Design a protein around this ligand. Structure first.
Ligand code: MG
Ligand code: MG
Ligand code: MG
Ligand code: MG
Ligand code: MG
Ligand code: MG
Ligand code: MG
Ligand code: MG
Ligand code: MG
Ligand code: MG
Ligand code: MG
Ligand code: MG
Ligand code: MG
Ligand code: MG
Ligand code: MG
Ligand code: MG
Ligand code: MG
Ligand code: MG
Ligand code: MG
Ligand code: MG
Ligand code: MG
Ligand code: MG
Ligand code: MG
Ligand code: MG
Ligand code: MG
Ligand code: MG
Ligand code: MG
Ligand code: MG
Ligand code: MG
Ligand code: MG
Ligand code: MG
Ligand code: MG
Ligand code: MG
Ligand code: MG
Ligand code: MG
Ligand code: ZN
Lengths: 50, 86, 134, 135, 122, 52, 60, 105
RNA sequence: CGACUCUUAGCGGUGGAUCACUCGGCUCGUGCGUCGAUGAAGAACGCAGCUAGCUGCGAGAAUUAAUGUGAAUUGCAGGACACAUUGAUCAUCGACACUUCGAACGCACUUGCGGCCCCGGGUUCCUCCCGGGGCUACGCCUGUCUGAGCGUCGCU
RNA sequence: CGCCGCAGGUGCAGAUCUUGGUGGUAGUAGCAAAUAUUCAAACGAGAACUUUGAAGGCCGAAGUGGAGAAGGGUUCCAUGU
RNA sequence: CAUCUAAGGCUAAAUACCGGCACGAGACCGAUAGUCAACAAGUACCGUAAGGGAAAGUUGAAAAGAACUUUGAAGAGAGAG
RNA sequence: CGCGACCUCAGAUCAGACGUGGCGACCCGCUGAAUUUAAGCAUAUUAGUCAGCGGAGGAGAAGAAACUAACCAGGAUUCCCUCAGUAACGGCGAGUGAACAGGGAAGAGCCCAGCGCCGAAUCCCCGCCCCGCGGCGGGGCGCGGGACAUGUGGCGUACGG
């Protein structure tokens, strides 16, 4: 809602910054074996526990 | 109707995030965490669930102090001494 | 054969220790043999590979006597790069080909105050072993 | 005595276990007194206790406690033993005189239940299957 | 232009703080340049300045701590961060003086009846 | 883990096998039948002095 | 407009801006971004000029 | 079910015996650990005879074993007295006095 | 004669069995056998030039110092780095530092609300505002100070 | 890998068996609750569905309108694919 | 007749160890096996919660990871390397 | 109708300490099932076991006889082999079930209270100085405080003193 506590908004804040695609230059690192952010989240598909 | 219609009127949280153990098991009305038991001092832990014990035991987290304690034991917990500067 | 009960002969442990080695003991793993003239003038067989010493490839596609200067040691990749050991890619530019330092022989070293000290310490140890083996 | 703390006096199954009222606690009331003083004063070490007149409904015991970090106790041998960490909360482990009596320890034919150092120590040893390498 | 902890250790706290200040203002303009685009060179000097601040702060924090340790040398009571830290259990034990002392009964028995070194022939 | 990995043999039987193995090492047909390439060796029960 | 620590109130923001930029501020309007960092709008005194200061800051 | 003809066997395996199973795979390791502690102890007491103090002659206390003799816990105070050595200095000599044994013979 | 359907074969797809490999387990054994109010385990939130996860770290934040080592790190860039008017990296780690919850400690879980004592500014001492620092949990031991009692007494 | 011995978590068609993959069904059922779309133009490789304009309609103020509370958590706004 | 001397206290060694630190080994398993987890695994995800809980290894010696020409709007092709 | 002594209590953000929580494989103290077996089932069994609560250490507990024995006697505890699936318990059904002696691993013994004697000989705390630091001790100095005769310390403990 519009009415939030500070600690909820700080929780929502972190979840926003870590829902970002991996940098493109990561693919070039030696022994990368990573391809995409597999922990990406969409607001409509899966909901936060909070 | 006990099915689809009844699921529409659920908009009141029963649990919130716990200050200790950070899990969303802090019952609002009871003011007690259902995961770590936090109105209380002693951490809630039962032997009838070994998976829950191993989900949150020692070593499942950062181990900030104890990981250096394991280091200092190998040298006898020495203090106030220096490596003899060049 | 191995008798010390505190050093392992396990294949998985040796491979794990080799591929996860820190940089400072990855440097020792990348040691390279010295030439016949370098072995006679000093008393040391193998020497860890440095940045700017000349070297010739003795195995692989790039065998020969073209004394090439080392231009980069890639301890992450366990390879070193040499001046003329290059390959042209599709676009036409040139890139170095990495070769394991065990497949090259050092012909001249890059000497500093530290290199001389390590050079002299290996010579004194072999001399000690030789006199014990009189 | 000890009443079994089951709601409405309902134990379930095996009428042998239907007992509620005439059941007795394994430890004496003196052991309970030392535990209650030891749990309150967690910074002191219970030494011993005695009896000072009971009641119809109460029993009164005086419990001797030792401060393990007083210098008068620390700087005097024959008392440094209680300052050692293995001697903390003796009354909870049944090491006090009152706590010991409920364990069935002793020498002789009367006390074969605790021949391993405790009742559980004896039970484990005589219920463990020794599977030697060569059988 | 690089600073080292070894050469910082001779200066007084008056210009050590002075050196920390202009080191902090330099990091302020560095973060400004990072926001306004700036250059790859200026971005790379952010880390070199951050470590320089830690270097200067470590020296003043150390220098203060050895002065406090020297001041409380021989004091009966010292602050909790100046007394040894080893382990809560190891701090509870008895010291060498009150671990090794014996009752007069025990040492009289030791004086009277010491363990003799002996052998038996065949 | 309690699979009875070990077996105990009687001491008399164990000595019996050792005696049998020693007796077989002195017959060239048996040692050759083990594929040991002893054709140029003399005196099949082969003894050297203690200098070795 | 600056980005400030979430633990700094408008008084410390005003003192910090006034001392480390040698300007006089009129009021501070603060908000915490959805990212989780504070944003401070620092209105300068009428005798100061933001463009003048923003030049000296380097954010022009 | 009994098949034809055998022992009436009563195995004592009704008590969840597989948690209290003592395996002996550390038997050879224990023998070494005890062996080298014996060697270390013997070399610590350099001239002392490496195997504890002297023990008395002792008769086994039952009609099944009273024909044989063995080594008891230690010498009794009456044998120490008539040998003219003090009960306190005896154990420093390596004699192992046992004060609660009496001599009826 | 086509079409369709079936059988077999070649080739091509779908699929990921088989085989070979293994920085992973499982089992056994050995030596140690060490947490915490000097604030643990655990959680939260932050920290990279470009960084989401994992990892490491704590406002000195993918680390400071010190010591060994001795020219790298590396996906790109950058500037270093005389390697002696002292050194990249890595390792070790004994100096320093170590945010917020948490036994969690001023009260409460709303970054809600206090109290006392010092310091600096606004004061231009008088104490109102702002900032900084240190205290303010419960139980309990020894001692200290202050006390209560028509408790037992002594002197008037 | 053969031969002499040793030891097995040693042989599958079934268990409405476990896991994974694949068929016929089958280009089939279906994409039918709440009246309704049409003309021209623009962008564009591409228009029944986008946008603009013109028309015909519907919600008809107890709305298919304008705002909030819980709840969600960036879905808000620009630009580009 | 024998035997001990309760109702106070301490005491090492031989003994135990499926948690922890660091090691060594194996007639074990070999990616549906072996730990749930060989991999950003107690992760993704599910449940109000207690709690439940996966799937997922392999180019090549070396990226030398296909320049360049051509058709298509591109995916995608044909040559070339 | 005050001022003192003691006793019994109280307050303090008083000076200096201590406990709390975690892990818990092993160990100690409690509490404690039912499935299952008995071809049903209630005593019995499962089992003093799972689950539950408390307390520790590198081990823990035990431990130096109010013992075993009945012998020509042995001699703390703990562990191994054996005793022994035995004596015994048991709807004497299903089932349960030790100890002594013997051989080994290890081996170690002691301290109080009391009864007495010794001018409280005893102990803590705060200051002085110096010898020191390195987990903080020694020495002496205080017409310095307190504890303590409602009993501190030395001798001494069933083997006698
Ligand atoms: Mg939804
Ligand atoms: Mg409710
Ligand atoms: Mg060699
Ligand atoms: Mg029953
Ligand atoms: Mg005495
Ligand atoms: Mg606001
Ligand atoms: Mg075909
Ligand atoms: Mg095919
Ligand atoms: Mg450094
Ligand atoms: Mg409120
Ligand atoms: Mg009065
Ligand atoms: Mg099978
Ligand atoms: Mg098969
Ligand atoms: Mg099949
Ligand atoms: Mg159709
Ligand atoms: Mg239709
Ligand atoms: Mg209408
Ligand atoms: Mg939008
Ligand atoms: Mg698997
Ligand atoms: Mg496969
Ligand atoms: Mg799996
Ligand atoms: Mg896991
Ligand atoms: Mg205080
Ligand atoms: Mg039945
Ligand atoms: Mg049945
Ligand atoms: Mg039934
Ligand atoms: Mg249990
Ligand atoms: Mg505890
Ligand atoms: Mg003990
Ligand atoms: Mg004991
Ligand atoms: Mg028999
Ligand atoms: Mg039983
Ligand atoms: Mg022996
Ligand atoms: Mg006395
Ligand atoms: Mg006695
Ligand atoms: Zn919780």
């Amino acid at each position: 809602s519009s009415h939030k506590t500070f600690r909820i908004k700080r929780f929502l804040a972190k979840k926003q910054k870590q829902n970002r695609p991996i940098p493109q230059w990561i693919r070039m690192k030696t022994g990368n074996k990573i391809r995409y952010n597999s922990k990406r989240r969409h607001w409509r598909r899966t909901k936060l526990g909070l | 109707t006990k099915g689809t219609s009844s699921f529409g009127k659920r908009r009141n949280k029963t649990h919130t995030l716990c200050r200790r153990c950070g899990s969303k098991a802090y019952h609002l009305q009871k003011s007690t965490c259902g995961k770590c038991g936090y109105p209380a001092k002693r951490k809630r832990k039962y032997n009838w669930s070994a998976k829950a014990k191993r989900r949150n035991t020692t070593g499942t987290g950062r181990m900030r102090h104890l990981k250096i304690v394991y280091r200092r034991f190998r040298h006898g917990f020495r203090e106030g001494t220096t490596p003899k500067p060049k | 054969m191995k008798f010390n009960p505190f050093v392992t002969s396990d294949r998985s442990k040796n491979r794990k220790r080799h591929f996860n080695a820190p940089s400072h003991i990855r440097r020792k793993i990348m040691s390279s043999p010295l030439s016949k003239e370098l072995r006679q003038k000093y008393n040391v067989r193998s020497m860890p590979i440095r940045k700017d010493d000349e070297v010739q490839v003795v195995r692989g596609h790039y065998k020969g006597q073209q004394i090439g200067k080392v231009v980069q040691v890639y301890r992450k990749k366990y390879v070193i790069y040499i001046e003329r050991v290059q390959r042209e890619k599709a676009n036409g530019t040139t890139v170095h080909v990495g070769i394991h330092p065990s497949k090259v022989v050092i012909t001249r070293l890059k000497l500093d105050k530290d290199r001389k000290k390590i050079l002299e310490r290996k010579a004194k140890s072999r001399q000690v072993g030789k006199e014990k083996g009189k | 005595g000890r009443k079994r703390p089951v709601p409405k006096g309902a134990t379930y199954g095996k009428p042998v276990h239907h007992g509620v009222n005439q059941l007795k606690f394994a430890r004496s009331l003196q052991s309970v007194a030392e535990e209650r003083a030891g749990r309150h004063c967690g910074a002191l070490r219970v030494l011993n206790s005695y009896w000072v007149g009971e009641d119809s409904t109460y029993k009164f015991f005086e419990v001797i406690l030792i401060d393990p970090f007083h210098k008068a106790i620390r700087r005097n041998p024959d008392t440094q033993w209680i300052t050692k960490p293995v001697h903390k909360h003796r009354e909870m482990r049944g090491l006090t005189s009152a706590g010991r009596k409920s364990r069935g320890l002793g020498k002789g034919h009367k006390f074969h239940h605790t021949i391993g150092g405790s009742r559980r120590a004896a039970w484990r040893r005589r219920n463990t299957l020794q599977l030697h390498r060569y059988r | 232009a690089k600073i080292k902890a070894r050469d910082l250790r001779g200066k007084k706290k008056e210009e050590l703080l002075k050196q920390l200040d202009d080191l902090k203002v330099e990091l302020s303009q560095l973060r400004v340049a990072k926001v306004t685009g700036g250059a790859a060179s200026k971005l790379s000097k952010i880390r070199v300045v951050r470590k320089s601040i830690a270097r200067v702060l470590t020296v003043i924090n150390q220098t203060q701590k050895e002065n406090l340790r020297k001041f409380y040398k021989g004091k009966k009571y010292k602050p909790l961060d100046l007394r040894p830290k080893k382990t809560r259990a190891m701090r509870r034990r008895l010291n060498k003086h009150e671990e090794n002392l014996k009752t007069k009964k025990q040492q009289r028995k030791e004086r009277l009846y010491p363990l003799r070194k002996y052998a038996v022939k065949a | 883990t309690w699979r009875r990995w070990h077996r105990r043999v009687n001491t008399t039987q164990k000595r019996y096998a050792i005696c049998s193995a020693l007796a077989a090492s002195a017959l060239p047909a048996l040692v050759m039948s083990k594929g040991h390439r002893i054709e140029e060796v003399p005196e099949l029960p082969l003894v050297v002095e203690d200098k070795v | 407009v600056f980005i400030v620590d979430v633990k700094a109130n408008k008084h410390q923001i005003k003192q910090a801006v006034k001392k480390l930029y040698d300007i006089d501020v009129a009021k501070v309007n603060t908000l915490i971004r959805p990212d989780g960092e504070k944003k401070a709008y620092v209105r300068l005194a009428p005798d100061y000029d933001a463009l003048d200061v923003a030049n000296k800051i380097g954010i022009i | 079910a009994p098949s034809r003809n055998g022992m009436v066997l009563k195995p004592h395996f009704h008590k969840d015996w597989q948690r209290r199973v003592a395996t002996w795979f550390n038997q050879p390791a224990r023998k070494i650990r005890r062996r080298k502690a014996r060697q270390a102890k013997a070399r610590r007491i350099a001239p002392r005879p490496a195997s504890g103090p002297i023990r008395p002659i002792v008769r086994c206390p039952t009609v099944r074993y009273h024909t044989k003799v063995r080594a008891g816990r230690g010498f009794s105070l009456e044998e120490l007295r008539v040998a003219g050595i003090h009960k306190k200095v005896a154990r420093t000599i390596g004699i192992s006095v046992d004060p609660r044994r009496r001599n009826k013979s």
